[PDB]
């Protein structure tokens, strides 16, 4: 393997912000990794630019494991979203370089294909239940076998939304009943609670939606305290998914080992890269837990390409979220993964199959954009 | 309550790097908060500059709790050293403002004094055991009632003073077995020369596995350590169980934590005796009050991390906190340089081995921005540790 000659970040906004890390070896071979942390992007950019990048110069790029441990342990302050995203970007770039050196697409390096295609789900959202059903129909036509459904509840800086738990709990089952009435049983139907309930509230929701057989009920409750899942699991057989806001195996080890969830959602970019996520997937597999990588637009095509490779190999694959990037984003990040009849197909190019067009990236300057916050009707700052 | 008219960071290196957040209200009143994260300073600087500061403008400065929740929950990505340090800086600055508004020193706002002075410990280090003993003698004469003792390990070139000593991480070498065979000799020697009154502390600094730390704890029981600190890496909190079940040497942990969720189980299971997470890295006064209160239910006491890499702003606020908190254990003292002290004027005092909280309204610390500008940032990273075979280990 060859030494790192150069490493640098690229920041671009082709429809939204992305941060990318590029590593270049003495042979000229290079790899890239996603470093995007939505709404806190420059924290990661600075973590990389000032503290990590300079330490990479001269390192042996082949030493993926050593580098991961060096950045993880060597930071002294361990775990965290900025921290683990910086580490993920390095890790992804190094796996890219290793696969290129091997002359293999990334999935081959990981252990080869376990499946012929990677099932996705699409976001189907409407203001009304009827609007949502319209979106489902349009996505089913495109070949999506699974859909995440959400509808309105009647009644630069962060936007401020208002929330009512009880109005939502009383309304949500109506959406799922309408989805089943219109589409029947074959369709996989997913729902994202987006952190807003307490455990016994989520247990009530879980029970209420059992007749609709959801693929998963996602992020029922904030789970910094992993025990938060216990009451839900004890009271419902609706499958549960969690973890897009996680960055470490230590955020979910207990959730997994106690069989409190069915799908782990932590993605490559935020969960410490391929190196770390293999270990999470493997722990999950001991307990029948499957992968369900977060895949919003705010993870770049670099992450998506690598995710599709990972998805193609991992035995306990569950599903891959798909929120299509804009044409501008796809142009900045040329890639060889393909979408066909509701599924991804991994690329065959050595590496994870994604590149970055630096000249085109430079046409789209960073523009600050923040995630919304949520407040209760009395003004209480809540979970968004 | 007044609105925030301005907010900004100040970066300065009067001997080492500090990052400070300053918040200014409509009336001109201001507060400051420590934002320093040793070896990753610019990540926090950017977190604040690019993402938090712009959202602070126009907010009601009196709404400390709401602002804490807004930044913690609103980030979406929760916890973590960069995240929680940024939040702590805001929180500290806002408590500073509130205490000034109340016309009270911070400890009064928290519930008043629980003690008349704040006991500290000093760092005593030397290449040989004899060198270390000379330092103990020197600090005991200064009035320290407590000392953390560290000495070199024969057959090991470098062991765990400003650790962030290079632009890029220095590479140290480590041998667990040489350390385990040697360390008890240090404590034996300290007790032989100084007797039983002195509080003696030791920092294992993350290098052992649980059963190894169990062995060490047992071996040092005769020497009655105040605490054995950071025995094992503790992302998996269960890592403390074997140690606790095998030794009665008191245990301290947590300088590398940033959330109550990093130590909830350690505390509730009674696996530690002292919690070390400090204000700057632990989400500020708002969060650390809750951590200290959970700890008190289980006889756990506070032992705030107090290295040079937390600024006088943190130290001053820590001393106020220490003065009020019922379950106070001890306050670490690593003296700042004269230049650092000049850049952050403050009213806490050190007398006869103890801190005395200030009496001026606020946390009693300010920053001289004109002076701070005279000391430019200089990157400094913490070292890494490798085993003798080259394995990247825990520093
Ligand atoms: Cl972080
Ligand atoms: Mg989600
Ligand atoms: Mg320590």
Curated annotation (Swiss-Prot), chain B:
Judged by the first EC level, this protein's enzyme class is lyase
Q: Give the binding site residues for Mg(2+).
A: 203, 229, 255
Give binding positions for substrate: 38, 123, 255, 276, 305, 309, 332
Does the keyword Lyase feature in the UniProt annotation?
A: yes
Where are the catalytic residues? 160 (proton donor/acceptor), 205 (proton donor/acceptor)
Tell me the impact of changing residue 305 to Q. Abolishes activity with D-gluconate. No effect on activity with D-mannonate
Q: Name one GO biological process term.
A: carbohydrate catabolic process
Q: Which PROSITE patterns match?
A: MR_MLE_1
Name what cofactor the protein needs. Mg(2+)
Alphabetically sorted, this entry's keywords are:
Lyase, Magnesium, Metal-binding
* Cofactor-binding details, from the entry: Binds 1 Mg(2+) ion per subunit.
Q: What is its EC number?
A: 4.2.1.-, 4.2.1.39, 4.2.1.8
* Superkingdom of source: Bacteria
Keyword Lyase carried by entry: yes
Site positions for Important for activity and substrate specificity = 307
The record's disulfide annotation reads none
Which Pfam families does the record cross-reference, listed alphabetically? MR_MLE_C, MR_MLE_N
Alphabetically, the GO molecular function entries are: gluconate dehydratase activity; magnesium ion binding; mannonate dehydratase activity
Task: Name the reaction it catalyses.
Answer: D-mannonate = 2-dehydro-3-deoxy-D-gluconate + H2O; D-gluconate = 2-dehydro-3-deoxy-D-gluconate + H2O
Role according to the record: Has low dehydratase activity with D-mannonate and D-gluconate, suggesting that these are not physiological substrates and that it has no significant role in the in vivo degradation of these compounds. Has no detectable activity with a panel of 70 other acid sugars (in vitro).
Question: What family does the database annotate?
Answer: Belongs to the mandelate racemase/muconate lactonizing enzyme family. GalD subfamily.
| Alphabetized NCBIfam families for the sequence | ManoateDhtManD (NF043051), PRK15072.1 (NF011654)
- Descriptive protein name: D-galactonate dehydratase family member ManD
Taxonomy, top ranks, is: Bacteria, Pseudomonadati, Pseudomonadota, Gammaproteobacteria, Oceanospirillales
């Amino acid at each position: 393997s060859l030494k790192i000659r150069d490493a640098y970040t690229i920041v671009t906004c082709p429809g939204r912000n992305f941060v990318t890390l590029k590593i270049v070896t003495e042979s000229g071979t290079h790899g890239i990794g996603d470093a995007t942390l939505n709404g806190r992007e420059m924290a990661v950019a600075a973590y990389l630019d000032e503290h990590v990048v300079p330490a990479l110069i001269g390192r042996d790029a082949g030493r993926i494991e050593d580098t991961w441990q060096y950045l993880y342990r060597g930071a002294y302050w361990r775990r965290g979203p900025v921290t683990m995203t910086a580490i993920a970007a390095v890790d992804m770039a190094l796996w890219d370089i290793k696969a290129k050196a091997a002359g293999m697409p990334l999935y081959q390096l990981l252990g080869g294909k376990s499946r012929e295609r990677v099932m996705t789900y699409a976001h189907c959202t409407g203001q009304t239940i009827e609007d949502c059903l319209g979106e489902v129909a349009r996505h089913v036509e495109l070949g999506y076998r699974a859909v995440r459904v959400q509808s309105g509840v009647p009644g630069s800086l962060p936007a401020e939304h208002v929330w009512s738990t009880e109005k939502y709990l009383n309304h949500a089952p109506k959406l799922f009943a309408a989805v089943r009435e219109r589409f029947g049983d074959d369709l996989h139907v997913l729902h994202d609670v987006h952190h807003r309930l307490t455990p016994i509230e989520a247990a009530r929701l879980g029970k209420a939606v059992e007749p609709y057989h959801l693929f998963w009920l996602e992020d029922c409750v904030p789970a910094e305290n992993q025990e938060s899942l216990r009451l839900i699991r004890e009271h419902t057989t609706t499958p549960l998914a969690i973890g897009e806001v996680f960055n470490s195996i230590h955020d979910c080890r207990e959730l997994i080992q106690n069989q409190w969830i069915d799908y782990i959602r932590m993605p490559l970019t935020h969960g410490g890269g391929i190196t770390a996520m293999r270990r999470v997937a493997d722990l999950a597999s001991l307990y029948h837990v499957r992968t369900g990588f977060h895949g919003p637009t705010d993870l770049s095509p670099v992450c998506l390409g690598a995710a599709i490779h990972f998805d193609t190999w991992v035995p306990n694959f569950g599903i891959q979220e798909h929120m299509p990037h804009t044409d501008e984003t796809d142009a900045v990040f040329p890639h060889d993964y393909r979408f066909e009849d509701g599924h991804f197909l991994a690329g065959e190019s050595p590496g994870h199959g994604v590149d970055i067009d630096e000249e085109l990236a430079a046409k789209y300057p960073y523009e600050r954009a923040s995630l919304p916050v949520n407040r209760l009707e009395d003004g209480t700052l809540w979970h968004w």
